[PDB]
Amino acid sequence: SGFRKMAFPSGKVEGCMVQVTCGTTTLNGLWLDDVVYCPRHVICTSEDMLNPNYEDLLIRKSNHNFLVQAGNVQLRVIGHSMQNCVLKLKVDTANPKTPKYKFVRIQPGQTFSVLACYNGSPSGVYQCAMRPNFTIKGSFLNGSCGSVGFNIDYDCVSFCYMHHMELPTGVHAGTDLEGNFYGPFVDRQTAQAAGTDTTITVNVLAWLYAAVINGDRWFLNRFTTTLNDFNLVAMKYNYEPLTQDHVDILGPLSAQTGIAVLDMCASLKELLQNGMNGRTILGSALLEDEFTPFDVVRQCSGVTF
Amino acid sequence: SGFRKMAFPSGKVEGCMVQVTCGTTTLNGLWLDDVVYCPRHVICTSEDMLNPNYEDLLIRKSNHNFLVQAGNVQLRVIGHSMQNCVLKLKVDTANPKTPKYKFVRIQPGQTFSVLACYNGSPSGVYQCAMRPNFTIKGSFLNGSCGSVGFNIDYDCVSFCYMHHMELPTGVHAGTDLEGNFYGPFVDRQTAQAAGTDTTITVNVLAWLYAAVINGDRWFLNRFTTTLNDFNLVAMKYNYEPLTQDHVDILGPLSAQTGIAVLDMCASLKELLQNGMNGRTILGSALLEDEFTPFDVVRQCSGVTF
Ligand SMILES: *c1cc(-c2ncccc2C)n2ncc(C3CCCCC3)c2n1
Ligand SMILES: *c1cc(-c2ncccc2C)n2ncc(C3CCCCC3)c2n1
Numbered sequence: 001s002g003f004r005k006m007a008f009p010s011g012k013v014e015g016c017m018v019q020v021t022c023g024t025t026t027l028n029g030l031w032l033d034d035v036v037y038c039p040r041h042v043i044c045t046s047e048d049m050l051n052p053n054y055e056d057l058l059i060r061k062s063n064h065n066f067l068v069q070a071g072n073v074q075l076r077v078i079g080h081s082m083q084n085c086v087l088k089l090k091v092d093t094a095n096p097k098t099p100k101y102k103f104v105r106i107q108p109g110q111t112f113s114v115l116a117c118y119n120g121s122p123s124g125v126y127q128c129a130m131r132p133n134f135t136i137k138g139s140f141l142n143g144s145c146g147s148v149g150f151n152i153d154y155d156c157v158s159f160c161y162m163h164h165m166e167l168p169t170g171v172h173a174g175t176d177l178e179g180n181f182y183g184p185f186v187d188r189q190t191a192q193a194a195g196t197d198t199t200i201t202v203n204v205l206a207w208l209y210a211a212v213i214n215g216d217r218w219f220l221n222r223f224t225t226t227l228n229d230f231n232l233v234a235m236k237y238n239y240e241p242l243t244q245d246h247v248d249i250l251g252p253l254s255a256q257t258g259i260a261v262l263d264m265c266a267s268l269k270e271l272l273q274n275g276m277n278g279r280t281i282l283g284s285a286l287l288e289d290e291f292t293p294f295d296v297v298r299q300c301s302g303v304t305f
Numbered sequence: 306s307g308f309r310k311m312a313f314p315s316g317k318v319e320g321c322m323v324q325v326t327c328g329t330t331t332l333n334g335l336w337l338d339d340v341v342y343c344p345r346h347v348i349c350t351s352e353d354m355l356n357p358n359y360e361d362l363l364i365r366k367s368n369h370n371f372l373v374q375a376g377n378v379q380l381r382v383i384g385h386s387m388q389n390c391v392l393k394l395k396v397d398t399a400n401p402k403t404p405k406y407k408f409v410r411i412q413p414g415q416t417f418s419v420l421a422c423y424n425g426s427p428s429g430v431y432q433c434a435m436r437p438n439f440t441i442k443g444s445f446l447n448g449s450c451g452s453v454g455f456n457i458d459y460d461c462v463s464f465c466y467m468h469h470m471e472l473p474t475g476v477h478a479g480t481d482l483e484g485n486f487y488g489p490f491v492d493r494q495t496a497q498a499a500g501t502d503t504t505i506t507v508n509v510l511a512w513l514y515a516a517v518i519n520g521d522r523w524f525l526n527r528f529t530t531t532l533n534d535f536n537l538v539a540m541k542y543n544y545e546p547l548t549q550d551h552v553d554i555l556g557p558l559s560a561q562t563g564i565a566v567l568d569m570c571a572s573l574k575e576l577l578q579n580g581m582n583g584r585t586i587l588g589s590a591l592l593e594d595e596f597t598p599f600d601v602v603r604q605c606s607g608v609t610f
Binding site for chain 2: 001002003004005006007008009010011014015115116117118119121122123124125126128137138139140141143144166170171172214215275278280283284285286298299300301302303304305
């Protein structure tokens with residue numbers, strides 16, 4: 001039936017995007033109820049970027065220094081505050097398009113959809129994973145700050161990411177909606193080490209199960225392995241160690257296909273050691289780690305919102 | 306800055322999805338103004354599927370045999386007609402969420418976003434290409450019929466595809482919004498040959514330009530080629546012949562990067578003949594053909610809607 005990197009429908013989030021301007025800087029904001037959330041770096045200028053004193057810069061700002069526009073609707077700013085690396089602008093009108101929502105701090109390896117925006121307007125939507133080193137490999141240009149990542153559960157939008165910056169390496173960094181960065185990153189123009197990234201093993205296994213469900217079974221072999229033997233191979237190829245928790249999360253896919261999790265690990269061990277010999281799996285010539293076990297079940301079961 | 310398979314924001318299309326039921330069959334419909342569009346195969350049963358007589362089956366139906374539900378809003382069917390392979394149900398209420406829209410018949414090689422739906426509810430969004438053989442490699446399950454493909458140009462949605470069926474090969478087939486199938490396909494349960502597919506050469510070249518823009522330049526070599534020499538290699542590797550029209554469409558990317566189109570063709574020639582030697586381009590170990598030159602410019606220039 002096919003398997004695609006599927007994003008959540010973005011409608012509920014499109015209704016929340018606004019443009020925030022402070023002086024010469026314009027970026028995106030998220031309008032939920034009577035609060036607009038945006039990166040605090042909206043208040044810093046070219047001369048400040050290397051190490052802004054956000055407390056001092058914010059003290060020089062008043063409510064009328066923040067211009068918020070939702071499409072053509074001009075919002076009135078009646079309060080401002082900084083929470084970690086986000087600015088929270090209280091507005092005098094609750095967003096009539098506010099969906100049911102939660103703010104969540106996702107774990108590394110989990111996925112979410114990103115609605116990339118510029119000037120408070122949607123440009124596109126794509127699915128991505130929070131890397132183990134807390135970076136995201138997105139697609140973002142200047143002005144994309146304030147774009148958000150989210151997941152949907154029936155009618156509820158769980159916002160998990162707000163884009164802040166590109167690192168000199170071309171990867172992306174941001175915060176949860178309480179303004180806490182994912183990873184060791186700071187909101188200043190400096191070279192910052194992201195550190196060693198690894199492949200999300202439980203996601204690669206989930207994608208191998210998605211492949212079996214779709215008829216791509218060439219990689220199934222006559223071997224089995226142990227959790228400890230597989231983890232020796234995982235450490236060698238910079239893959240995350242597999243735990244019993246990960247095995248338990250793969251239970252539904254193991255049940256649907258009749259392939260024991262450790263048998264799928266022995267197939268993955270052979271692909272790591274021998275490569276793919278010019279073959280493809282679900283249209284890919286690499287081992288894909290951007291689908292969680294939940295993503296595979298949602299896509300293979302047609303879960304709606 | 307990264308490069309992702311980016312879909313259009315789906316909000317404008319989510320507001321148009323409805324559920325259409327006729328007897329025991331339920332699928333998706335598209336509600337635009339006072340007309341609901343859906344696959345005509347909504348009127349066929351398990352005993353008819355092999356070769357339905359759609360004219361006879363439709364004659365046995367009346368307006369009250371079609372139930373249309375938009376969320377929880379029950380629409381009143383006041384007219385029905387068949388146009389090619391689509392059914393057009395006239396309803397007594399114009400959709401208040403109707404966007405500015407056009408119906409278009411896309412050319413093979415062009416791309417569009419698909420909003421996959423079940424029971425009139427959105428499940429996900431993804432970008433895909435109309436293959437040269439007029440199939441689509443989507444992600445669709447039973448009940449996905451009536452889901453649509455579209456492109457957006459500022460505030461206008463151009464609908465180009467309505468999903469009808471999966472072929473026994475696992476690829477997907479459908480129609481434009483006037484009910485004409487793309488390709489030689491018919492709406493019946495039979496084995497149908499899609500014929501030889503080829504790789505969309507102009508799209509592979511556009512993606513190589515996107516790679517150069519993002520700093521992946523390892524594949525740039527010291528060779529050049531001619532349009533005729535490159536076409537000898539294209540025929541050998543089942544790639545579409547490149548024409549001057551394709552060279553002209555790549556003009557903006559050639560200008561932005563300073564790499565002449567024929568020089569990029571000589572790089573592509575070397576990748577086809579020598580493979581990628583275990584290297585990747587924009588995170589892929591295969592040559593990607595699902596980005597048009599327009600898609601690359603939109604993504605690299607941050608075009609909003
Ligand atoms: C907003 C957006 C971006 C950005 N994201 C992706 C690609 C390019 C760019 C420029 N940003 N990158 C860095 C920053 C900085 C500005 C100075 C304060 C710290 C964050 C940024 N903002
Ligand atoms: C609707 C949806 C699908 C479908 N799409 C993707 C994956 C699985 C399935 C079943 N359909 N496939 C075939 C058809 C037929 C039904 C009988 C008439 C011709 C079309 C279909 N409808």
